[PDB]
Amino acid sequence: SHKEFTKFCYEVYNEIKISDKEFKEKRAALDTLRLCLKRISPDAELVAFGSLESGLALKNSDMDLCVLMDSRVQSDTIALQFYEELIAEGFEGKFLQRARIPIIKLTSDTASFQCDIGFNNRLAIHNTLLLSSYTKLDARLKPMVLLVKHWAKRKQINSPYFGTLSSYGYVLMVLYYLIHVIKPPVFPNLLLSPLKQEKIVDGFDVGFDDKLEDIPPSQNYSSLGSLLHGFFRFYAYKFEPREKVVTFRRPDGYLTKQEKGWTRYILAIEDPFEISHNVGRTVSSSGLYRIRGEFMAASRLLNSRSYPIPYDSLFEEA
Ligand SMILES: Nc1ncnc2c1ncn2[C@@H]1O[C@H](COP(=O)(O)OP(=O)(O)OP(=O)(O)O)C[C@H]1O
Ligand SMILES: [Mg+2]
After folding, report:
1. How far is CA 266 from CA 98, 153, 171, 273, 278, in A?
2. What own/partner pairs with CB < 8 Å and gap ≥ 24 does 171-174 have?
């Protein structure tokens, strides 16, 4: 059904997606950051990943960048040189190193410009390649993702530091639903494709079928509204968070926490490429309770027999 909800979903979609204005400003910011990188290292290369790159950006979007360079170069050395140029060129931020990983976090621009810079973070590039490819495979993914991220933020269930889930996690929960749950599938599993060639980067297989022009279109013709209602329905009522693991490495999407050795693991989502990383590791016990509760409320709302049926409340701050 869901005809007026679809129309509603597209209306909200258009108000929340990054404007061309902002996209173009972010892209100018990246060009500026590249010239600073040139000035101190000619061979190093500054790449974008996540939201802006994959086209899943809300308004007021943060920026995820990665410096690529020769692995035989010490990454802290050029990281500090790059940091020193950024201060000098007028950006404000922090230089930190977590374990062996040097990071630059920019916060302003002498209001707020917010942008992270990783060094040789080759795996994030691939994570974004996968999601970029899926975005190009079916036009319904992008608005679906943006609405789910919008909903998660309004429900205070999108805070990794406070026991809930990252946006990337929610994206994977969407993809997982569209690949291994909905029937017919909205997408195939590009990682398990017969056509997939292996590609090892930093010890993980990041290969997937990227011959995108060869794939038959989805045989699922559900409106954006049905998909969304399906998605909320599945995580509210059907998915089992204590036993099961969100995965992209099984043909049938079945994976138990025990096989994986994942008895923190209150919510378990196996990264598609870094399969040793639980994307939902930040999820606390109280976090998960609020996440499920919101999933259920979303379902209850979209079932509602009332008139007027208040779809707006889907995005009211909980
Ligand atoms: N929890 C995580 N574990 C491993 N990698 C992550 C995690 N969160 C983010 N990343 C990496 O950074 C990329 C996107 O990060 P993130 O900002 O959470 O999502 P997003 O697409 O930017 O949504 P936003 O609009 O930024 O909230 C994807 C992945 O390579
Ligand atoms: Mg981001």
Report:
1. 24, 20, 18, 21, 10
2. 171/56, 171/131, 171/145, 172/246, 172/248, 172/269, 172/271, 172/272, 172/279, 173/148, 173/231, 173/235, 173/246, 173/269, 174/141, 174/144, 174/145, 174/148, 174/231
Give dist(CA 116, CA 267) in Å, integer: 26
- Per-residue tokens: 237: 């009522």
- Judge whether 6 and 228 are in contact, CB under 8 Å: no
* Helix (H/G/I), strand (E/B), else coil: 103: strand
3-state SS class at 262: coil
All domains of the chain in start order, with CATH:
1-17+138-318 (1.10.1410.10), 18-137 (3.30.460.10)
273 lines ligand 1 (CB under 6 A): no
* Ligand 1 centroid distance, CA of 153 (Å): 14
What tokens were used for 77? Answer: 């050395």
What contacts 238, CB < 8 A, 6 or more positions away?
Answer: 181
Does ligand 1 have an atom closer than 6 angstroms to the CB of 50? yes
Residues 6+ apart with CB under 8 A from 133: 190, 208, 210, 212
Instruction: Supply 14's token pair.
Output: 């258009």
Nearest to 7 by CA among 143, 134, 138, 170: 143
Resolution in A: 2.7
> Is the Cβ–Cβ distance between 171 and 131 less than 8 Å?
yes
The technique by which this structure was obtained is X-ray
Give DSSP secondary structure letters for 171-202: HHHHHHIIIIISSS-SS--TTT-TTPPP-EET
Q: Ligand 1: which atom is nearest the Cα of residue 123?
A: 30
Pick the closest to residue 279 from 138, 137, 128, 164 (CA basis): 164
Q: Which atom of ligand 1 is nearest to the CA of 127?
A: 30
Residue type, 11: E
β-pairing verdict for 101-109 and 115-119: antiparallel
**Token digits for 185?**
């599938």
Q: How many CB atoms lie within 10 A of CB 231?
A: 24
